[PDB]
Amino acid sequence: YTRVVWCAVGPEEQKKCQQWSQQSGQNVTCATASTTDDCIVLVLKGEADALNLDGGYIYTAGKCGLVPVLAENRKSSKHSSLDCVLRPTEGYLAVAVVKKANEGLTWNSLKDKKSCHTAVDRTAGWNIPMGLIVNQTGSCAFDEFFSQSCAPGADPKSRLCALCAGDDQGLDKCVPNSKEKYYGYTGAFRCLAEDVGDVAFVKNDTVWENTNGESTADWAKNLKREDFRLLCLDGTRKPVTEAQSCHLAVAPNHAVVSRSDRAAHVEQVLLHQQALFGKNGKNCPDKFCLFKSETKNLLFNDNTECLAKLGGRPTYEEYLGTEYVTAIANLKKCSLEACAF
Ligand SMILES: *[C@@H]1O[C@H](CO)[C@@H](O[C@@H]2O[C@H](CO)[C@@H](O[C@H]3O[C@H](CO)[C@@H](O[C@@H]4O[C@H](CO)[C@@H](O[C@@H]5O[C@H](CO)[C@@H](OC6O[C@H](CO)[C@@H](O)[C@H](O)[C@@H]6O)[C@H](O)[C@@H]5O)[C@H](O)[C@@H]4O)[C@H](O)[C@@H]3O)[C@H](O)[C@H]2NC(C)=O)[C@H](O)[C@H]1NC(C)=O
Ligand SMILES: *[C@@H]1O[C@H](CO)[C@@H](O[C@@H]2O[C@H](CO)[C@@H](O[C@H]3O[C@H](CO[C@@H]4O[C@H](CO)[C@@H](O)[C@H](O)[C@@H]4O)[C@@H](O[C@@H]4O[C@H](CO)[C@@H](O)[C@H](O)[C@@H]4O)[C@H](O)[C@@H]3O)[C@H](O)[C@H]2NC(C)=O)[C@H](O)[C@H]1NC(C)=O
Ligand SMILES: *[C@@H]1O[C@H](CO)[C@@H](O[C@@H]2O[C@H](CO)[C@@H](O)[C@H](O)[C@H]2NC(C)=O)[C@H](O)[C@H]1NC(C)=O
Ligand SMILES: O=C(O)Cc1ccccc1Nc1c(Cl)cccc1Cl
Ligand SMILES: [Fe+3]
Ligand SMILES: [Zn+2]
Ligand SMILES: [Zn+2]
Numbered sequence: 001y002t003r004v005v006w007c008a009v010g011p012e013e014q015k016k017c018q019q020w021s022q023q024s025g026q027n028v029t030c031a032t033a034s035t036t037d038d039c040i041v042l043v044l045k046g047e048a049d050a051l052n053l054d055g056g057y058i059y060t061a062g063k064c065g066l067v068p069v070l071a072e073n074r075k076s077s078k079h080s081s082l083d084c085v086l087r088p089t090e091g092y093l094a095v096a097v098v099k100k101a102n103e104g105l106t107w108n109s110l111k112d113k114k115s116c117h118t119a120v121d122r123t124a125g126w127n128i129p130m131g132l133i134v135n136q137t138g139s140c141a142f143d144e145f146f147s148q149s150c151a152p153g154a155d156p157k158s159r160l161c162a163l164c165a166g167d168d169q170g171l172d173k174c175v176p177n178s179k180e181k182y183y184g185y186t187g188a189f190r191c192l193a194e195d196v197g198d199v200a201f202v203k204n205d206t207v208w209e210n211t212n213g214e215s216t217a218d219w220a221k222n223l224k225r226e227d228f229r230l231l232c233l234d235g236t237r238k239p240v241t242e243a244q245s246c247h248l249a250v251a252p253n254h255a256v257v258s259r260s261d262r263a264a265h266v267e268q269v270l271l272h273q274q275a276l277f278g279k280n281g282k283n284c285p286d287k288f289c290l291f292k293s294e295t296k297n298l299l300f301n302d303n304t305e306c307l308a309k310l311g312g313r314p315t316y317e318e319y320l321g322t323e324y325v326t327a328i329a330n331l332k333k334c335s336l337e338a339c340a341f
Helices: 010-023 036-045 055-063 123-137 184-193 204-209 240-245 260-277 316-320 322-332
Strands: 004-009 028-033 050-053 067-074 092-099 114-117 148-150 199-203 228-231 237-239 249-251 255-258 304-309
Touching: 004 010, 004 036, 004 260, 010 028, 010 260, 028 036, 036 050, 036 055, 036 255, 050 055, 050 260, 055 067, 055 123, 055 255, 055 316, 055 322, 067 260, 067 316, 092 123, 092 184, 092 204, 092 240, 114 123, 114 184, 123 184, 123 199, 123 249, 123 322, 148 184, 184 199, 184 204, 199 204, 204 240, 228 240, 237 240, 255 260, 260 304, 316 322
Parallel strands: 004 028, 004 050, 114 148, 114 199
Antiparallel strands: 050 255, 067 255, 067 304, 092 199, 092 228, 092 249, 228 237
């Protein structure tokens, strides 16, 4: 049989991947790139097999021919008799979060404020909110909407990167990988928590997972849910308990992608790997946990219960949903067809 070559984005993911590789007895090995797009390119070249992707990245990967293989499944809201691997996924809720103390800030007063985004091209952090903003403003100048932002992946000298902080050494400012302090769900939420930005574009889970003791991180350990509010599209503000009635969109879950000709093998290997290292896997937590990384969401989101089988052998467009695909396409007209590589 063949090894599966995972692609890790940045050095922290690479360290975790290397641990996984060792524990997997080399059934999984690691390639690494500086950005998700570069990992997608390694896979396109056949120099890596697979990685787990946010839905926007799935769009990029899908235009280039890669296919969804298995999806992140978090704990469900409702009892299900089904095994996690066979439980239909529920998408996650993309939200716009602000501080309660920032009174009078609403969806309709976002112009000229400071924003924190997971990364350019990601679902909750970018495609959904910027797509909505472009539409409502009738303008493609989304790079001039917020006074300053951290939007990892943007031009580092631009306003879209002005709030990004890079690493310990201040290096890698605005890179779209975990070195950047404010990268990803957790980074963008931290950007809001520290009042670097006025608004964070993340998902509902992020708020809950980093407040009220759920995170022991120095920056998060003392945060309280009641100190945050969600911005609803109708211009109201709601407590973070009201995400189901105050979100920007329902996002398709992050999912593993690969070339078609490697998909069945990547799938088989991952199903076995999670049986070993997944949530209440045979050798997790004793040996290694594939879905933990000290609330850093490395390789997979830390709230992943399992990678689940897809229904109906879906194309990337079916997986993302026609709604979301068209929204991405419309936004991309600002900055239809074909691989971006
Ligand atoms: C924003 O993001 C947040 C972070 O992810 C989300 O919060 C997380 O949400 C999950 C669940 O959705 C939450 O859940 C965990 O909770 C427990 C462990 O704490 C887990 O175990 C349970 O699973 C069972 C199945 O769903 C449930 O068991 C019961 O339900 C029945 C029926 O109601 C009851 O039985 C009865 O009692 C009533 C009384 O009259 C009677 O009707 C009946 O006759 C019946 O006999 C029992 O009371 C019992 O509750 C139980 O609900 C629970 O789900 C669960 O699966 C998860 O592990 C996480 O704790 C939570 N995380 C944090 C940090 O808070 C938000 O949900 C999300 N918001 C939105 C809107 O999406
Ligand atoms: C920014 O603004 C943009 C411009 O409006 C937004 O893009 C547009 O988004 C719309 C919503 O996605 C498109 O509308 C489409 O809606 C139709 C119906 O879709 C279905 O849902 C029903 C009900 O569940 C189902 O039956 C079905 O399975 C679909 O899921 C589309 O389809 C039609 O199909 C039916 C039969 O199924 C048929 O009767 C019709 O003839 C028709 O073919 C329809 O074709 C639409 O695409 C808009 O087209 C789209 N506009 C543009 C210009 O592209 C964008 O979302 C905004 N961005 C954000 C972030 O909000
Ligand atoms: C690495 O992968 C190999 C191949 O799938 C695994 O070995 C297989 O294990 C299953 C269960 O033991 C057996 O049915 C097969 O016969 C084995 N195949 C071969 C050729 O060895 C192995 O368990 C995996 N190891 C880890 C740690 O992931
Ligand atoms: O119309 C479509 O193409 C897809 C569609 C419509 C309504 C509800 C869900 C979905 N698709 C969908 C699928 Cl099939 C998987 C994961 C996430 C999503 Cl949003
Ligand atoms: Fe996402
Ligand atoms: Zn909704
Ligand atoms: Zn299909």
